[PDB]
Design an enzyme around this catalytic site. Structure first.
Site: not given
Ligand SMILES: Nc1nc2c(ncn2[C@@H]2O[C@H](COP(=O)(O)OP(=O)(O)OP(=O)(O)O)[C@@H](O)[C@H]2O)c(=O)[nH]1
Ligand SMILES: Nc1nc2c(ncn2[C@@H]2O[C@H](COP(=O)(O)OP(=O)(O)OP(=O)(O)O)[C@@H](O)[C@H]2O)c(=O)[nH]1
Ligand SMILES: Nc1nc2c(ncn2[C@@H]2O[C@H](COP(=O)(O)OP(=O)(O)O)[C@@H](O)[C@H]2O)c(=O)[nH]1
Ligand SMILES: Nc1nc2c(ncn2[C@@H]2O[C@H](COP(=O)(O)OP(=O)(O)O)[C@@H](O)[C@H]2O)c(=O)[nH]1
Ligand SMILES: [Mg+2]
Ligand SMILES: [Mg+2]
Lengths: 57, 427, 430, 430, 427
Positions: C15, C137, C219, C245
């Protein structure tokens, strides 16, 4: 009937969306003159004004 | 006749060189399409000094562009005077310079050294009356600091007799643009001391100072700084291209200014300097030029001579003017300021006169000198490098390329010897 | 010429990438359909017939996030190759996404990356987006960087991750995934940037006039920082700074690889008419703790690295005035062994705006990246969090059954301690 | 070039500031929206395009007064960040406004005032308005000066306060708030001017031709005094007086700063048609005991300070004759310690009239600022009032329960007694 | 030829200087744009004394404007003759001095003094032969008194030979503009006694009285008040600017008038002064001027000499006149009033004649003399200084700038010594 209409809300906000750009501060200053002193140009006009008034007028 | 070749480094060198070739184009009267369109026959007298003539009347400079990345070359090619350069006189790498001295000198330096020396031979062997080399580089960078010294050492090995005169920009005292610059300057000077014959030092912050104090430039751009540097470095070679009542070539300048092999760093300065307003109120004369040349607010280098003492110094004048006036003014300025000069060199100063002044000015002068005030500049980097000595861990970034830590100690020992050398010549 | 590759894992990464490629399309003037109504080669490829393709791969273990792009308006731009998606998400488990499921599709991901690597003549860096708390992630990202480290070796691997907030937490087992990922990143990553969601929420509430933001607003703020970071290569500038750099200047030690991000100006679409937006003004706003994209006070430590990139009409003359003014601030502490401190970059491209954007159409902007000991404050909270549950062994069995060997948990704990000791030792003047 | 900043505290301070900036905008020819239909930099800043901004910050612990400005016509001129509103007021309690609630918002207020000074290059001076009777004005003012005194050091801090009236009052705990404030500004204030509402009402009724003035009419009268004081910094004149000149001339010691003020002519817009009001005419009207806006007896108050700021067509020769004529009067007795005793400022800018105003269109006017020992008369009245209530401990419980120590009351009581002792010693001959 | 450098300090100095250069330009015939538009070649003999020449037939006055705040400078720039002054001559600070003499000397005088000294040296060494400096200042305390005396000391250190002639407007001892004057006046006298050669005292009250009595001005404007002082200044230097039957320079005036090093304060006067209406009926001759010059009302210092006695007297004249008439009239005015002169000095009265009179007047004169009547002015300010120092009021501002009260005692000791010297020499 009563007539009371005014839409300051749009006028303030739509204008605030558009002309945001602040502080132009145009950097158009050039050095090439200072190394090429125009004092010669100013004295050229000074003599031209001096001669026209004293001689012609 | 009395030929010179011009070499440029990546970002600082090629931008300054770009403005310089504009400056020479105006002085000799070169149309932006490379065809001569001047107004005097005196221009074509010694055009062979800097230019070659191609069949058709198109004149091409003796210049070579060197960089590790193509970022600057695109800017120069699209420039106003980009056509003038030879299409085959562009040499560039295909990797990030990384601003690293060791990486630039060793990793990509060896890859590019073979090609750049071959391209240089084109100009070197095609000029019969050659006496000169002109290098433009920055000391805080990665392409001119490292690879520039690599070219300097190789050229010295090939052609010992030719003069190796280079122009250098030093990292600023307060804040320079990059973090690792104490390392870059210390490594670069070690090669510069042994190899180069004449070194010119220019400071960016002093250029800002001159713009505010004298020119009153509310918004000074990079072109303004390059113009001042181009004014000075074009004035040095004026004796080789135009007649004069008393000539002073590069070798005359070197012999007079250099008393000993290592103490050959030079400070530069140009006169007259004035702003839009007061230029109309100035009575431009030789004593006024003498005031500006020796003025403590007109040097391109931020080093106060009054904190130290003077070695030999020189000044070159352009324009139709009296010889007695020059001799009297320099005799008076020497007798007025005895304490700043050294007794064990009588006649500390040198004079020269050229017939033709630059365009727009009826008379101008160029100041080149040497003094003990350079030790403050070396102390600045030495103190910063000493704090970087605890960051000999940070030097692990350098050793990953192939450099060994003992080189840094060798370089700083050379700085310590040079600083002590200046101190002992103060007495 | 010089090309960069971007890869996105774990919802949040995708995203954010959707926001970035929206921003780049407008910045260069590329319609979503890929045709024109420049410097494309830095990020896009001219495939002929007027169509362009981005240099990016999206990989997620579940199809929901990727199906959003497939069914969205963006679908005509991306190659169907670049939209890889799995059959089953890792579900907040580091072990599940690294061993049981990660190895099912990891070979597929690398082949597509290498296939794009054939078209990159001057490939000199990678951009990777993570969410540390996520299972996909963290788990998939660890395996991918470990594989990519040996595939290419001497190539820049820049990361952009989202740290868990000091108080806001969406995953209960988040510290477990955070530490294990950190232990794997600390050996391979060249330099990983640090942001958190809570600071984004506070900055968006105070500076911008948004009563209730969503993930889209967060985002877009991140995307602007990415655009400012990548503008040095893409456009002509008085001071262009290369990816390598940044690697030399930002991380002046062995394994300290985590700087913090800052961006100014961040002003409403309403106030800035009433303000001077001077470069001295925006420079001073960068160092104020209220503008940090990470919730850690700099006054708890010191600085040892700074990098400022100016997008706009910023004349180099004033830049020297601004940085000199900053050094006079007593509230800012610089370590003794970094007298220089700063790396400057000036680029002539103005900031990019988005239709329905949350930010003003400012003429000039500056992106700041800084490495400081204050991130150690963030370590101590994660370390204490992990120690509390693991003392009672709150979630050991879930990870162990999914391929985790129990001996790995203490090993990653000691690796974090070494990072804390290394950070503390660097902060000591010598 | 040369610049001033103003701060407004409490219920009373904002309303006076409201009147002042209408006076400045009409004087400088600025529409309420900030666009023109010079000396602007002294009070205003040009924010690009064609809009201006005032160098003022409005602070109060209640949102009612600030929200009035936000809803008023002048809302376009002010910057929303400049309008800071608290949550619950001090309830006329110095202890509550100094410690419990004042400390909640003090850091936010101090950030904005310092942030505004960054655009303020040729800056020397501050203007702070206080309501001595109110708890917020007295409580917040002491804390605000304590912070500004140490943050800025040697900077001209000048205050325009409203002294409690000898008999007219609106708060029963007014003497407590005044005495606790007088203890703090006696050390943290460079020089502060005061007027009382009782004499303002009387002057507004006898000399002026208003049967029943409101607070708006009194604020307009106050604004003209402030405008005359700042007239030298904005326009050329035969004798220009700077902020440093006022501080040097008006006080002979450190704790004797308190001057009194006088403005002439104060004739009305309808009665003004009959008089030319030459220099000698206005000069004599200044020294009348009835023309003071502080209800003090000049018979008991010797003069050791005078400042005569003239505005309009004024010839220095006439002023010298007028001052010489004034000195011959036996009733106006200067102290032996003040032979010369005069500062004068002649400025070519005539005063300004406001539509819907309550002042004559006089061609020339003079504002008077002098220090006299008659102020010790007001201190004795305040001292007796404090003693009567504190003897039986009338209201000790409210201040003690809000974080203020009981022992501070005798400390502030002794501080006044020393101030009165200083005035008696200085007034005595030697 | 024989040059003089003009320096203006603070509010009072710049307004007097603006009128002074207006008078000088009218004398020599210089158009406000710097062009020569006069009709007399004798104006060009000694134009070098007060003016430098810029290329292109323009003349730049030898005027340096000095202040600590820009308000006065902006007024002078907008003035009618503001274009004449060289823009770089303008040196100013960014702070109202506050008229604290300790502040104006130590706090802000030291910082600015370095810049003013170099700007002074710019014009100082640009002349063929400097002879003396001209300074205009008031004894206020901020910049005219504090910085003025500091610059006077520095110039005395630099140029012991040259004449440091300063013009001083003493605070008017019945009505004046600030309560802290006698502190500033006492310290300024202490510095001016030792370091200055010629000090001219001018009172505003006497200027007001002169205007009302002789000029019949209904509203005496500051323009006419400065005009009278400017006329007196021009007459003093008129002998050097034009030929005459008997010349007299500053050094001749200094040697003749000053019997002892400390007693060198001068009262000045001018004639003819006539109202705008009755000048047609006046038969202007030498006896008419002698009556006007020695009239106790035409003097612009409010100290009646009939109370005291005279020591030296000087007379200047402008125009064509018979030398016998000046010699005879002077002897008669000496011989009648024997009760007002010292017995041990015969021929107490000096003469000088200049060929060219000022514009508009067929004949003119200037009176400069030294008398014991100055004892009143010093006694008045001493009594005021005694009162405040006994109370020690207003001194906290000076203490905060680092000035200790023992300096005041030393200054008053010098002031008392000067009074006693005047008292004993009256016998
Ligand atoms: N800045 C930002 N952070 C986000 C956004 N969506 C999710 N996050 C953060 O990123 C994390 C995503 O981790 P998960 O909810 O576990 O999703 P994933 O990375 O696919 O991991 P799993 O689905 O459990 O395998 C969340 O805990 C949020 O804190 C977003 O749209 N913008
Ligand atoms: N001249 C003048 N004085 C005012 C005005 N309004 C209030 N005051 C004075 O202010 C005093 C009371 O304090 P407030 O105005 O309520 O200000 P404050 O310090 O915020 O008081 P609290 O909110 O109760 O803490 C009264 O004694 C009045 O003398 C006004 O409009 N004009
Ligand atoms: N005065 C000036 N300095 C420049 C210019 N371009 C680059 N520089 C300086 O050069 C430094 C970068 O060094 P680098 O370009 O690697 O040096 P080079 O390899 O010798 O060209 C920067 O810190 C700038 O301060 C220019 O156009 N003018
Ligand atoms: N004669 C005359 N005196 C003036 C004029 N303007 C100001 N003054 C006097 O000059 C004094 C101010 O001197 P100032 O320049 O401030 O000296 P400083 O305070 O020491 O810097 C005042 O007392 C005025 O009386 C003028 O135009 N003519
Ligand atoms: Mg995620
Ligand atoms: Mg209130």
């Amino acid at each position: 009937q009563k007539t009371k209409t005014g839409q300051l809300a749009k006028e303030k906000h739509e204008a605030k969306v558009r002309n945001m750009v602040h502080g132009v501060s145009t950097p158009v200053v050039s050095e090439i003159k200072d190394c090429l002193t125009y004092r010669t140009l100013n004295e050229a006009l000074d003599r031209a004004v001096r001669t026209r008034e004293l001689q012609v007028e | 006749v009395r030929e010179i070749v011009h070499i440029q480094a990546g970002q600082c060198g090629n931008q300054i060189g770009a403005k310089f070739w504009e400056v020479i184009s105006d002085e000799h009267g070169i149309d932006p399409t490379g065809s001569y369109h001047g107004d005097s026959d005196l221009q074509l007298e010694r055009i062979n000094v800097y230019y070659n003539e191609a069949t058709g009347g198109k004149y091409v400079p003796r210049a070579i562009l060197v960089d590790l990345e193509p970022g600057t070359m695109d800017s120069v090619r699209a420039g106003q005077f980009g056509q003038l350069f030879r299409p085959d006189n562009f040499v560039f790498g295909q990797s990030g310079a990384g601003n690293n001295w060791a990486k630039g000198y060793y990793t990509e330096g060896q890859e590019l050294c073979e090609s750049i020396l071959d391209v240089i031979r084109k100009e070197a062997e095609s000029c019969d009356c050659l006496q000169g080399f002109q290098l433009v580089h920055s000391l805080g960078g990665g392409t001119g600091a490292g690879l520039g010294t690599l070219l300097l050492n190789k050229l010295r090995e090939e052609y010992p007799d030719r003069i190796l005169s280079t122009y250098s920009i030093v990292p600023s005292p307060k804040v320079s643009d990059t973090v690792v610059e104490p390392y870059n300057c210390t490594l670069s000077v070690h090669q510069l001391v042994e190899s180069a014959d004449e070194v010119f030092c220019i400071d960016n912050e002093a250029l800002y100072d001159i713009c505010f104090r004298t020119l009153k430039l509310t918004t000074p751009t990079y072109g303004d700084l390059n113009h001042l540097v181009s004014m000075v470095m074009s004035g040095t070679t004026c004796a080789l291209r135009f007649p004069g009542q008393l000539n002073s070539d590069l070798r005359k300048l070197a012999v007079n200014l250099v008393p000993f092999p290592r103490l050959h760093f030079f400070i530069v300065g140009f006169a007259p300097l004035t702003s839009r307003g007061s230029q109309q109120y100035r009575a431009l004369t030789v004593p006024e030029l003498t005031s500006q040349l020796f003025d403590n607010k007109n040097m391109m280098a931020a080093c106060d001579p009054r904190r130290g003492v003077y070695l030999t110094a020189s000044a070159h004048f352009r324009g139709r003017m009296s010889s007695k006036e020059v001799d009297e003014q320099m005799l008076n300025i020497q007798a007025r300021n005895t304490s700043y000069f050294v007794e064990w060199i009588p006649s500390n100063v040198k004079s020269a006169i050229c017939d033709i002044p630059p365009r727009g000015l009826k008379m101008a002068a160029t100041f080149i000198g040497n003094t003990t005030a350079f030790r403050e500049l070396f102390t600045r980097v030495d103190s910063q490098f000493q704090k970087m000595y605890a960051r000999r861990a940070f030097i692990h970034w350098y050793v990953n390329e192939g450099l060994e830590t003992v080189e840094f100690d060798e370089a700083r020992s050379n700085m310590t010897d040079l600083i002590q050398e200046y101190e002992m010549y103060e007495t | 010429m010089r090309e960069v590759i971007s890869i996105h894992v774990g919802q949040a990464g995708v995203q954010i990438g959707n926001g970035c490629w929206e921003l780049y399309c407008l910045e260069h003037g590329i319609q979503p359909d890929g045709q024109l109504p420049d410097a494309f080669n830095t990020f896009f490829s001219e495939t002929g017939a007027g169509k362009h393709v981005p240099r990016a791969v999206f990989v997620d273990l579940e199809p929901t996030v990727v199906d959003e792009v497939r069914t969205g308006t963006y679908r005509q731009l991306f190659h169907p190759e670049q939209l890889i998606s799995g059959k089953e998400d890792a579900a907040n488990n580091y072990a599940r996404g690294h061993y049981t499921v990660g190895k099912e599709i990891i070979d597929l991901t690398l082949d597509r990356i290498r296939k794009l690597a054939d078209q990159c003549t001057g490939l000199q860096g990678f951009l990777i987006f993570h969410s540390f708390g996520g299972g996909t992630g963290a788990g998939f990202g660890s395996l991918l960087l470990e594989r990519l480290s040996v595939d290419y070796g001497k190539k820049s691997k820049l990361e952009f991750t989202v740290y868990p907030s000091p108080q806001v937490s969406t995953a209960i087992v988040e510290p477990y995934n955070s530490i294990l990922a950190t232990h794997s990143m600390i050996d391979h990553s060249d330099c990983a940037f640090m942001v958190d969601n809570e600071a984004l929420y506070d900055l968006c509430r105070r500076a911008l006039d948004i009563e209730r933001p969503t993930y889209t607003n967060l985002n877009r703020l991140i995307g602007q920082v990415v655009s400012s970071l990548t503008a040095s290569l893409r456009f002509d500038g008085a001071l262009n700074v290369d990816f390598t750099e940044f690697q030399t200047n930002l991380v002046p030690y062995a394994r300290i690889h985590f700087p913090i991000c800052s961006y100014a100006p961040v002003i409403s679409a309403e106030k800035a008419y009433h303000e001077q937006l001077s470069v001295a003004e925006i420079t001073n706003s960068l160092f104020e703790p209220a503008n940090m994209m990470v919730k850690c006070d700099p006054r708890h430590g010191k600085y040892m690295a700074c990098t400022l990139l100016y997008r706009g009409d910023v004349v180099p003359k004033d830049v020297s005035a601004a940085v000199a003014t900053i050094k006079t601030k007593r509230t800012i502490q610089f370590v003794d062994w970094c007298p220089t401190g700063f790396k400057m970059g000036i680029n002539y491209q103005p900031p990019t705006v988005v239709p329905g954007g949350d930010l003003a159409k400012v003429q000039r902007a500056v992106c700041m990246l800084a490495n400081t000991t204050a991130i150690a404050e963030a370590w101590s909270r994660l370390d204490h969090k992990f120690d509390l549950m693991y003392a009672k062994r709150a979630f050991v069995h879930w990870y162990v059954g999914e391929g985790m060997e129990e001996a790995e948990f203490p090993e990653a704990r000691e690796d974090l301690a070494l990072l804390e000791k290394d950070y503390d030792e660097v902060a000591a003047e010598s």
